[PDB]
Amino acid sequence: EFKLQELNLTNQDTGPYGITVSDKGKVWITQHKANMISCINLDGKITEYPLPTPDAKVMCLTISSDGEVWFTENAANKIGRITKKGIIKEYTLPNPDSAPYGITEGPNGDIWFTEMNGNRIGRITDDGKIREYELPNKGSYPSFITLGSDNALWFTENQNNAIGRITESGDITEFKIPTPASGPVGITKGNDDALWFVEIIGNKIGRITTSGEITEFKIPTPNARPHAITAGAGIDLWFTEWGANKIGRLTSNNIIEEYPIQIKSAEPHGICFDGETIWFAMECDKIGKLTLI
Numbered sequence: 103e104f105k106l107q108e109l110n111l112t113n114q115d116t117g118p119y120g121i122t123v124s125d126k127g128k129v130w131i132t133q134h135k136a137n138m139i140s141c142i143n144l145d146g147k148i149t150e151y152p153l154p155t156p157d158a159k160v161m162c163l164t165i166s167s168d169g170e171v172w173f174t175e176n177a178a179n180k181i182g183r184i185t186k187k188g189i190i191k192e193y194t195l196p197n198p199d200s201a202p203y204g205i206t207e208g209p210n211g212d213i214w215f216t217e218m219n220g221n222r223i224g225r226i227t228d229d230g231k232i233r234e235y236e237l238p239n240k241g242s243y244p245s246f247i248t249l250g251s252d253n254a255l256w257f258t259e260n261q262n263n264a265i266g267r268i269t270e271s272g273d274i275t276e277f278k279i280p281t282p283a284s285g286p287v288g289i290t291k292g293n294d295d296a297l298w299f300v301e302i303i304g305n306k307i308g309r310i311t312t313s314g315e316i317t318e319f320k321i322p323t324p325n326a327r328p329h330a331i332t333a334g335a336g337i338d339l340w341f342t343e344w345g346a347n348k349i350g351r352l353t354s355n356n357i358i359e360e361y362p363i364q365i366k367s368a369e370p371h372g373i374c375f376d377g378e379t380i381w382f383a384m385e386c387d388k389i390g391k392l393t394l395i
């Protein structure tokens with residue numbers, strides 16, 4: 103069993119999507135229809151940051167170690183940044199229609215991101231300089247990206263049916279997933295030091311060690327359409343089932359439990375865990391807060 107609370111956001115049908123939480127306790131969400139980033143503090147103050155570029159399709163975000171928020175503008179071909187001063191800088195990608203998507207901090211503190219349509223991994227510095235690494239197979243659709251325990255970046259190749267690894271020097275290794283045409287999407291680092299990902303078509307959670315060894319676990323609800331995944335406490339992983347309106351949990355003897363979301367077309371997207379609470383973005387201008395026990 104489990105407890106759920108909600109946070110209302112609603113300037114209208116804003117398309118809440120990506121979510122993260124500061125160690126300050128602040129939650130940040132992107133809102134792709136409203137074209138904005140919102141943060142809510144624990145005392146409930148909300149700040150909405152309209153993007154300078156209209157119809158930018160803001161997708162994913164991350165908080166860097168120095169506290170700034172970085173994000174991808176999927177339709178506007180840009181990486182954005184909200185500085186500590188609350189000012190937004192954007193940086194335009196060198197090739198057009200790159201469709202940046204996933205975003206994460208790397209081992210030396212640069213910001214790394216996938217280009218879905220550009221078929222590249224990007225890298226940007228403090229000072230806005232961009233470096234990019236072309237993927238070997240065309241039409242790979244690199245999607246989510248995370249830092250692995252090996253201090254390499256790991257990402258899903260949604261249409262090449264593989265997990266890629268890229269080191270700080272740009273060396274790429276692709277591990278083919280054993281479930282054909284499985285559609286990997288979310289990936290994250292587990293506390294077991296492997297990477298864990300979701301297969302949207304496969305209806306599986308996957309695990310890949312930093313040496314490339316892949317195991318899979320069948321999600322009980324058919325057509326669950328999992329999307330994002332995050333580590334929990336211990337060896338727990340938590341994931342969103344957009345298709346089934348549930349929150350999934352991999353706990354433990356690699357059992358998958360599911361917790362149905364009491365509400366309507368929640369269509370959960372992003373997910374984050376803060377040591378006690380599972381936070382997730384929901385389509386209907388809300389954020390969910392889930393807790394066990």
Ligand SMILES: [Cl-]
Nearest residue numbers: 208209210212
């Ligand atoms: Cl780095």
